[PDB]
Design a protein around this ligand. Structure first.
Ligand SMILES: Nc1ncccc1CCc1cccc(Cl)c1
Ligand SMILES: Nc1ncccc1CCc1cccc(Cl)c1
Lengths: 389, 395
């Protein structure tokens, strides 16, 4: 399986998001759209905004259809307001098809757009159950599969550079691949291991065990999925439930105790720098998340390195030091496997078989001593009890 | 209890006008004195008067007729988004007939050219900028009138304003005969307010800048980062008609106000503050509109207070295009790209004390605020509020 036309069709970074080019309307209006497996709405800027240098102009599209309905999407971290309608949509570097899908024309927003991100909209790839205003608004991917012969599946390879990318660099660099309707074998190494999609709303999965450098965090596995665990490319960090986060930071601190870092670092707020090339990767532990497998009483694990959970950021002085921010934070809405984590793997969203596959990414950052991994199987009992109800 | 006395009778009721065209006070300039009506503006710092013929002016400052006129041989250009005026700087003897019994020599910008500055039928021929020197044009070396007044006399460094909206439209004849409020120069008149005065600090001395720490619509917290409320600043400006809010705050507020008043549907033009809405005489549904509360930083650490206005304040009375017997209004809240602006609309609900001496602004329920039998404007406190300093904006 190889989809050369879709390989390397993404750009961006964990801190500002990964996006793919799309066109909307007739004549085609090109827009960069954030790939988000954590939401289910296709929404684009449709009015001037200081952070946008282009937006969807409905009056210029002959195929625009007004649904005469508004949609308000408030989140704890931000919000966007829009007007619903439909239009013809295509993905230049994707399947050779055009479909009529729902589009939320964003007219008002609060902390939605990111200065310098280079994207003007968002592509919610999750299910209708969480679509705004309600599940009657068919998500883009659903329209795509229903209107074409494209297989009900997509895979994502998000590629973190391992170092800071400046304004021009991030615009020229290849940030990864989104293969629509298939799996490209050149994007990963080793085997793919699948965990079931527990329920079709967010891409929900179940974590059954957590290790820090092989040491079991030893918590009731229900804590790991309280109140849910999801794969969300729309979130930067690996976010863990309060109690799990507190235990993990204690363990990570213990493992890296040869060097002390200020509280602000562990709060993911302030950066830490080291002289060029001297980042002490080896003092930081690897983190393993065991996921439910498709076989009864069987599980597998994905292991990430500090190269994944330490996010490269530019120093205020733009010096030659190598700096990073701690990309693991506290959550009140369950575990969130954000961009940070996805960068270590090729992730297959097998909608058709209700499962998510993980394989070591061909573009994950590592060193000569350790590598990310996807290994199995392991015998694990009562994994169903790890899920929250 | 104890009844509060009014000690500045000579200045009480010395204002005229309305929110839409501004409130003004009578002043005299030159020798012999030339009488002119001057717009009271806490949003600027220049004393400028028409000094040449203009279609909307019935009179103007005639420098050649004043024996005390002094030419500063300097020009001044004051452009704004909504208008501009140009003039020639100089000084002369100035007085306020219904104010302190003193005469001082102050700077006067003789307006020779203007665009969209003078308003037809406002009845004022000049402006009195009461803010600080930092925002004076051309620069802070041009001492503002109030500074001159305080430096040259024994008048206390403080003034208070009671702007009185009528609650209904006033035609040309009526607005000329009606008392529009009071400007007490050098003191506080207790007959102009009820309840207690609560003070918020003047954050910085340029505009009369304050800090809003919380906003509620009918008791419901707008729940925005308080920094948003003061982006990029929050000021008290009698020279502005509406309550203006930062874009994001306006969007959130209008949505909440719409939700609270949802039993009635209004056209987009209304919410944009552009078109009026009318109801049969006496049937304005005040009760369906929410009260709005703005919490301000108090003078005591971690303490705040709130001022609450009614729709009687934020819905501005306007005459129907058909001069019918309907009661009509325009929505007097609009967005801003220059921070929050507590304009005349809001000031009409309170007696506002500009305590320059103690770098603070006091608020109290106005004795002339419009209300109904069920609700009244209010100034209440104290409330425990933490990290209020973080609400202030810094470039
Ligand atoms: N992908 C997500 N994950 C968690 C919560 C919300 C989203 C949607 C994307 C998003 C993120 C922050 C602010 C806004 Cl306005 C929208
Ligand atoms: N007080 C103010 N507040 C905001 C902006 C400008 C002013 C000055 C008064 C004013 C009002 C309208 C037009 C002009 Cl030309 C000047």
């Amino acid at each position: 399986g190889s989809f050369v036309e879709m390989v390397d069709n993404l750009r961006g970074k964990s801190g500002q998001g990964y996006y793919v080019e799309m066109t909307v309307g007739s004549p085609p209006q090109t827009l960069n759209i954030l790939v988000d497996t954590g939401s289910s709405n296709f929404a684009v800027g449709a009015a001037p905004h200081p952070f946008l240098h282009r937006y969807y102009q409905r009056q210029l599209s002959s195929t625009y259809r007004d649904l005469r309905k508004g949609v308000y999407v408030p989140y704890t971290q931000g919000k966007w307001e829009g007007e619903l309608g439909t239009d013809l949509v295509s993905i230049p570097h994707g399947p050779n098809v055009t479909v009529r899908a729902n589009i939320a024309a964003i007219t008002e927003s609060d902390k939605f757009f990111i200065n310098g991100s280079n994207w003007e909209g968002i592509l919610g790839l999750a299910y209708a159950e969480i679509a705004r205003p309600d599940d009657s608004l068919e998500p883009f991917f659903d329209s795509l599969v229903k209107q074409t012969h494209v297989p009900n599946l997509f895979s994502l390879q998000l590629c973190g550079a391992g170092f800071p990318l400046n304004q021009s660099e991030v615009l020229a660099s290849v940030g990864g691949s989104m293969i629509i309707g298939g799996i490209d074998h050149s994007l990963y190494t080793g085997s793919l291991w699948y965990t079931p999609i527990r329920r079709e709303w967010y891409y929900e999965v179940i974590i059954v065990r957590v290790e820090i450098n092989g040491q079991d965090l030893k918590m009731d596995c229900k804590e790991y999925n309280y109140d849910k665990s999801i794969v969300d490319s729309g979130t930067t960090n690996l976010r863990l439930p309060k109690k799990v986060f507190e235990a993990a930071v204690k363990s990570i601190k213990a493992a890296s105790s040869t060097e002390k870092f200020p509280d602000g670092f562990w709060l993911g707020e302030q950066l830490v720098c080291w002289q060029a090339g001297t980042t002490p990767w080896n003092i930081f532990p690897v983190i393993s998340l065991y996921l439910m497998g498709e076989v009864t009483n069987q599980s597998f694990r994905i292991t990430i390195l500090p190269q994944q959970y330490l996010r490269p950021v530019e120093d205020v002085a733009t010096s030659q030091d190598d700096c990073y921010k701690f990309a693991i934070s506290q959550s009140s809405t369950g575990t969130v496997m954000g961009a940070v984590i996805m960068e270590g793997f090729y992730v297959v969203f097998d909608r058709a078989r209700k499962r998510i596959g993980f394989a070591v990414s061909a573009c994950h950052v590592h060193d000569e001593f350790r590598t990310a991994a996807v290994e199995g199987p392991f015998v694990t009992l009562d994994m169903e009890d790890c899920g929250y109800n």
